[PDB]
Amino acid sequence: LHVAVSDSNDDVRRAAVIALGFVLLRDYTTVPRIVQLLSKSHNAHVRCGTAFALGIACAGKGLQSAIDVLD
Amino acid sequence: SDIYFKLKKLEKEYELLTLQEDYIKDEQRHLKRELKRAQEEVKRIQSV
Amino acid sequence: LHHSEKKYAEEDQVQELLKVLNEISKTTLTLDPRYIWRSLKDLSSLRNQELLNAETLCFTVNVLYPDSSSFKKNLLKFITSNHKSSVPGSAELRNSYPASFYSVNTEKKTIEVTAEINCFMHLLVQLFLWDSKELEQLVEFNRKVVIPNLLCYYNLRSLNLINAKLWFYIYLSHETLARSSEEINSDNQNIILRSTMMKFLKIASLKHDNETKAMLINLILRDFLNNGEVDSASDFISKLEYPHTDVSSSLEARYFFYLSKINAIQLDYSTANEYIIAAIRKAPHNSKSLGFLQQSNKLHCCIQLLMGDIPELSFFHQSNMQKSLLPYYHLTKAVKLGDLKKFTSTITKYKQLLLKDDTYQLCVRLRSNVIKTGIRIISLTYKKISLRDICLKLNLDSEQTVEYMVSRAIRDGVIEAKINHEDGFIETTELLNIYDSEDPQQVFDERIKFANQLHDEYLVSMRYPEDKKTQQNEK
Amino acid sequence: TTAAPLLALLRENQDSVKTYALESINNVVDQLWSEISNELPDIEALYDDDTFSDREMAALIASKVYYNLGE
Amino acid sequence: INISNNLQKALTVKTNDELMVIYISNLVRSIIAFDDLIENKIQNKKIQEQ
Amino acid sequence: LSESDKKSKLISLYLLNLLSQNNTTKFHSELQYLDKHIKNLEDDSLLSYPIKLDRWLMEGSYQKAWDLLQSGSQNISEFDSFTDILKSAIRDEIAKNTELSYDFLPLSNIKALLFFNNEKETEKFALERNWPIVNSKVYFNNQSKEKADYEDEMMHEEDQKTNIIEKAMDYAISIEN
Amino acid sequence: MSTDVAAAQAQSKIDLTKKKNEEINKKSLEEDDEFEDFPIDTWANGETIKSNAVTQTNIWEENWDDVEVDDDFTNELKAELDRYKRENQ
Amino acid sequence: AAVTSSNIVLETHESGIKPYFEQKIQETELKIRSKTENVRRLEAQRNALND
Amino acid sequence: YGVLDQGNGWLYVYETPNQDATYDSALELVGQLNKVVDQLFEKASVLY
Amino acid sequence: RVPNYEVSEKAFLLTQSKVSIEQRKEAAEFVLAKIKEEEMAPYYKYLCEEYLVNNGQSDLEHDEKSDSLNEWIKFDQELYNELCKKNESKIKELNEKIQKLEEDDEGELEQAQAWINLGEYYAQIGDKDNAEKTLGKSLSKAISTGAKIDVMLTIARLGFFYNDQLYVKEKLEAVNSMIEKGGDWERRNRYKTYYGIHCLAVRNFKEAAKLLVDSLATFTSIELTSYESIATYASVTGLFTLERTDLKSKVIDSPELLSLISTTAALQSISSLTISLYASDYASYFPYLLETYANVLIPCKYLNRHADFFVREMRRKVYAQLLESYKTLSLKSMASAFGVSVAFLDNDLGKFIPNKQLNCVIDRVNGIVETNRPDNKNAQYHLLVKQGDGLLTKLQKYGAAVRLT
């Protein structure tokens, strides 16, 4: 999470967001909050990388909450 | 007690909220520096 | 008539409580559920008193009780029995709905949540007997109800809030008997009383319940003032543990008023004076703290004299009463001129009043400060004045007698001066300009630190009303 | 009433009164603890000497005082 | 440092403003939020009746 | 009952005991108790004797107080056993007052003021308070210098001052936080 | 009512049905009203007029030498004559 | 009482795991209120900067 | 901007007493902002 | 109405113990006559009670004390005969007005005018109680807005006469609401005089300087104090508010104070003082203080109530002019100039040193009088901190309040 802010090359910014989802497969209902700020981030790459993360995290069995963040 | 052993796993979850709370301050600083940067460009255009 | 009026009155009383039980059990928000009980207490009592006070007895049976019933019945007998006027089907209805108490909990009796309901009930009876006044046994009966409610119903933070009023009246009823007269009952029970409330205080620490801790503190502190065993009150305030999170503004005054007294008897009059101004700032006032506020003014004036710098004659005129401050206006004047005879005449005159207010001990020292503040006007008025001239003014024995009095005062810092013995005069030292010294930087530091704290606090308190409203039932 | 009788027994230089002091104090360690804290150093002193059997008692009492304060 | 003290005090009134706006916002949002629910019950009620 | 004649002597001698140790703090606490106890109800147990010394220390007249000690050793209630102590206690108290009052004094003047019957006592007392007795004058300022140095060596005095580099930087991080 | 008056205490912390019970608790723990201890006990009340704007509780501002008597008319009168006696001696 | 524990005897200091339950559950319920309100506070400000 | 000595016949003369030209402005600053707070306090507290 | 000032001012000399013995006896004869002419016996019943335990007291309604210094003014049986007679007569007068105008003419407009006339009489005979009742009847029923303003001023006059400022206060609120509603500039001048006298009696003097000088421009003397009084009051108020520099520009040079010049003893004593204080002759100043005590403070009703406050003020004021214009001067030098003894001077300066209105300190050893006045950088620092301390306390309480709720 610190990484996404700390580098200015925007490939890395994207990557960090994506990667969180795999870490947080236990958690299903914490993930829409962690990336709630990252949809409203101004940088196109942080935004890109939000969609993957939410996707990975709640894959399989739907969740209303996750979809609402992604709209 | 049952609630108490389920707790242990909940407390870890609250700790990631703790880490969100530390993360805001790091985002804040980045934006504030940058608001002044964004403004610098517009001063270039204001002048000659 | 009677059978109907009591019927409806019992069932309304149960319903209002059942809701504030529910209210507190939904997250934490301590202050607001509490406030409901404070507005309610006042009203519930006056409604029970009209239409015979056996409207309380219907309520008392419509709770599961440990031994409240016997104590309540006795009063009814005394004003002529009212147990045939409040009768079952109108004093005992559990029904089949909850609004006169839930039927499922009552029968089962191991799920019951009667607790807080029960605490509010007891309080009502204790109050009626408190108005009337009964002592000795009254302390015993109260004390006997209260401890069972800790012990048949499990403790929560929520439980401590409402039993925080129960504590007040036991403690209070014992102090009033104690100041009436000593008694075999009073000496012995004082030991129990002092100790049991100290035992809840660390348990309150463990709870993290800030409202509870404050009320136990204030009660211990007060007993030490009443019997004069302030050798203890000193040890009590070596420690600090008083919270300010869930502590009410009304209470914060309470701590500071008594704290101000202990500091005055360690002969540190600097932080005594600090906490008495402070006490008024926290304090609200309307008319119901009128006694407290009157004594707040009296205590401030005693402290200011102890330091050695007089308050004004205008200071009491610009107070919005002087109608009990008439002795301490006379005290400002008597110290002020440097006159000893005036001090003798008033202290004898107002002896009963001084004795009551715990201001008589300070007046043994303020006899001493007649002369010490007598010096303070004369050394201020005249920068350089001979030793002999001050013997004129304050009618002092010898030139050497002058030097001794002034020397003490300047170690205590009252004069701010220096005695020169080779040129035979006292020279009052300058303050100079401190604008060119580093003193204004200390004052600002105080100001800067407090202001930074206000900007951080407001942001937290944006959020808090929003939670309260969301929980609240629709509007 | 204060703990002032209880503190006085410790200070007394006869060894039999020192043993006796802790027997009384032990009961009221949790009930008065803001008036038994003056002669807490008297209680730490008795541990140091191995000629007392009241080493045990001195520690037992001593630990509890710190918790009552909330340390 | 004195001028820096007065500047700080000024910013206390500024953040004391933001608080108010939110406190006003909170009373308006809470009334209209609840009004909607009530108003919906009546709507549903028309459907049920026939 | 719980009463004795011997009761009266113990209260009065106990008030003098605190005073000489300079537990004037405790003196004022201890008084409150005894006023409710016997001062209001049985009048005097010879309680005036301590209370009067206290008054004269607080008033700041050491003549009055020294005079009552001189008389109190011409009397017995066992006040003779506490006068010696309260003689020594008063002498240490006036040295503190007299640092700020004087810059220097004749050795015959310090002798009169802090009450002494030899010049061996007056100079012994001076060199305890680290004041040279050279020129036949005392020099009070000399002890004041050395107390100030003691304080500067410790790290408890440096942050109480609070330096201007520290104040600005701690000021800056609250804002940027 | 001393430095920090009764008005600021009602306007800052607003008197409510919520706060009155708490205030009752302040008064009771102290024990009783001590506004009412003085006119029963003493059978007297505070300061009264002496010329008006000098004494008596008022929003009129006062003097700091109010208690001191007006003999000042005399003292200036005696000052002139006494001054001729010293100079012309 | 005043010489024996004989009040608040139904929890707290009964077996050591008993006071462990009590201390911690009260800390957690206070903590979750603090962490949510701060995270909300701090997000209102970061949205303002973004804005 | 002087004062007269009668203690030996001298006239002490000084130019204007030096003063904080800044602190004049800062009295006016406090006077402006202070009425802003009375309004803030009135309006936020007549809600409840 | 118009007789109230003349009557009360003379009457106040008998009440006072501190006046001249011959001026007081001559005064007793004049005031006593005015009672006989108009049957002012109810306010003479009022005057009797105010005398009690003073010199100048002679009466037979109550008791006569051993303290006396008049014998030329008493109650009579004759005085009661005129009371019984005149009162009965008054009853019969007012009855015809009321009956006739209600019935014949219009009830609202005409009776209300009849009731303004009644309310004139009630002021004349020194009944306040009936004057206010019927003049309240005049507001109730219809009348012009200008008259509603005048009637109100009439009720307000009654509080000076009996001499309670609380009474006055209530009435002037009403006058201030309707003065700007009709917008009458003639009747405003009248308002400036009434609020000015009310201010002169009370603690305030500061504002009363403005008010009084602007009522010297345009004045109505009908139901208002003598002009000679306004001129004298105007001078004293000048002292209290203004510094010595602006004394000469704003009060003494006012050309509607130099049209009258001086025409009574009271204006002459005050006029001599004001100029000599600016002129920096303190030789005649201390002698003129004695005169101003005699003729301005004691006879005047409103200034006998700040008889002490005047002494304190005007000693301070003199001391303030030298001490910013002098540093390290003898006490000795100052006494010989002043014409006062040395011993009184030491004592007067020490009244104000503890309150810090001199900020000055006095070597007794060599008689030197030192000067340490603030006016520097440190002075700006003290003002700025007293403001910024008050701002802070306000921010603390208010912030904390909003936060709890």
J402 lies within 8 A of chain E by CB: yes
Say which DSSP state F75 is in: S
Q: Give the minimum alpha-carbon distance from E43 to chain C in angstroms, rounded to a whole number.
A: 18
Kindly tell me the burial class for residue J237, based on how many C-beta atoms sit within 10 Å of its own C-beta (0-12, 13-18, 19 or more): buried
Count other Cβ atoms within 10 Å, centred on residue J61: 16
Q: In what order do the strands lie in the sheet with C425-428?
A: C384-386, C425-428, C417-420
C322 lies within 8 A of chain G by CB: yes
Rounded to whole angstroms, the Cα distance separating J66 from E33 reads: 85
Helix (H, G, I), strand (E, B) or coil at J116: helix
Cβ pairs E/I, distance under 8 A = 27
Count other Cβ atoms within 10 Å, centred on residue C251: 21
User: What residue of H is the nearest CA neighbor of A34?
Assistant: H39
The verdict on a CB contact (< 8 Å) between E31 and C475 is: yes
Convert G29-79 into a string of H (helix), E (strand) and C (coil).
HHCCCCCCHHHHHCCCCCCCCCCCCCCCCCCCCCCCCCCCCCCHHHHHHHH
E24 lies within 8 A of chain C by CB: no
Torsion angle of the four alpha carbons C37, C40, C44, C46, in this order, in degrees rounded to the nearest 10: 130
Rounded to whole angstroms, the Cα distance separating J154 from J223 reads: 8
Mutate to test the interface with H, among A5, A33, A37, A41 (most CBs of H within 10 A): A37
- Give phi and psi for I12, each to the nearest 5: -100, 130
Buried b (16+ CB within 10 A) or exposed e, J310-325: bbbbbbbebbbbbbee
Rounded to whole angstroms, the Cα distance separating C353 from G37 reads: 9
The verdict on a CB contact (< 8 Å) between A42 and H50 is: yes
Which DSSP helix (H) or strand (E) runs through J237? helix J227-241
The verdict on a CB contact (< 8 Å) between J328 and I5 is: yes
- Give phi and psi for G20, each to the nearest 5: -65, -35
The verdict on a CB contact (< 8 Å) between H12 and C203 is: yes
Neighbouring residues of C414: CB distance < 8 A, sequence distance ≥ 6: C307, C308, C309, C372, C373, C376
Count other Cβ atoms within 10 Å, centred on residue J309: 22
Neighbouring residues of J206: CB distance < 8 A, sequence distance ≥ 6: J240, J241
Q: How many residues does chain C have?
A: 475
Measured at the CA of C427, the angle between CA C422 and CA C428, to 5 degrees, comes to 160
Q: How far is CA C178 from CA C165, C183, C187, H14, in A?
A: 20, 8, 8, 36
User: What residue of E is the nearest CA neighbor of C466?
Assistant: E26
Task: Tokens for B12, please give them.
Answer: 């870890």
Counting Cα atoms < 13 Å in the Cβ hemisphere of J380 gives 17
Helix (H, G, I), strand (E, B) or coil at C86: coil
Mutate to test the interface with B, among A6, A29, A30, A36 (most CBs of B within 10 A): A30
Closest CA to J256 of J227, J297, J220: J227
Closest CA to J165 of C316, G45, G59: G59
Rounded to whole angstroms, the Cα distance separating C376 from C380 reads: 6
Rounded to whole angstroms, the Cα distance separating C58 from F133 reads: 90
F123 neighbors F133 (Cβ within 8 angstroms): yes
> Partners of I13 in the beta sheet?
I2
C142 neighbors C169 (Cβ within 8 angstroms): yes
Helix (H, G, I), strand (E, B) or coil at I13: strand
Angle between helices D15-25 and D40-48 (to 10 degrees): 120
CA J255 to chain centroid: 23
> What are the residue ranges spanned by the domains of chain G?
23-89
Neighbouring residues of F58: CB distance < 8 A, sequence distance ≥ 6: C365, C368, C369, C372, C408
The verdict on a CB contact (< 8 Å) between C290 and G19 is: no
Neighbouring residues of C254: CB distance < 8 A, sequence distance ≥ 6: C218, G26, G29
The verdict on a CB contact (< 8 Å) between F28 and C267 is: yes
Measured at the CA of J193, the angle between CA J187 and CA J198, to 5 degrees, comes to 130
User: What residue of E is the nearest CA neighbor of I32?
Assistant: E10
Neighbouring residues of B4: CB distance < 8 A, sequence distance ≥ 6: H21, H24, H25
Residues of B in contact with A37 (CB under 8 A): 24, 27
CA G42 to chain centroid: 18
C109 neighbors C151 (Cβ within 8 angstroms): no
- Which sign does the torsion angle of CA D19, D20, D22, D27 carry? positive
Give the nearest partner residue to H37 out of C154, C200, C460, using CB atoms: C460
Q: How far is CA F75 from CA D36, F20, F78, J183, in A?
A: 39, 19, 8, 90
Q: Give the minimum alpha-carbon distance from H40 to chain B in angstroms, rounded to a whole number.
A: 9
Rounded to whole angstroms, the Cα distance separating J167 from J156 reads: 8
Mutate to test the interface with J, among G51, G83, G87 (most CBs of J within 10 A): G83
| Partner chains of I (3+ C-beta pairs under 8 Å) | E, J
User: What residue of B is the nearest CA neighbor of A20?
Assistant: B16
| Partner chains of E (3+ C-beta pairs under 8 Å) | C, I, J
Rounded to whole angstroms, the Cα distance separating F60 from F74 reads: 24
User: What residue of H is the nearest CA neighbor of C192?
Assistant: H2
User: Which residues of J lie inside 8 Å of I (Cβ-Cβ)?
Assistant: 324-330, 333, 368, 371, 375-377, 379-381, 383-384, 387-388, 391, 394-395, 398, 401-402, 405
Rounded to whole angstroms, the Cα distance separating D31 from C196 reads: 7
Q: Give the minimum alpha-carbon distance from A42 to chain H in angstroms, rounded to a whole number.
A: 7
Residue whose tokens read 């920096």: J280
Rounded to whole angstroms, the Cα distance separating C372 from C414 reads: 9
Task: Tokens for A61, please give them.
Answer: 């069995």
Rounded to whole angstroms, the Cα distance separating H46 from A41 reads: 10
G15 lies within 8 A of chain J by CB: no
- Give phi and psi for D16, each to the nearest 5: -65, -35
Residues of J in contact with E16 (CB under 8 A): 395, 399, 402
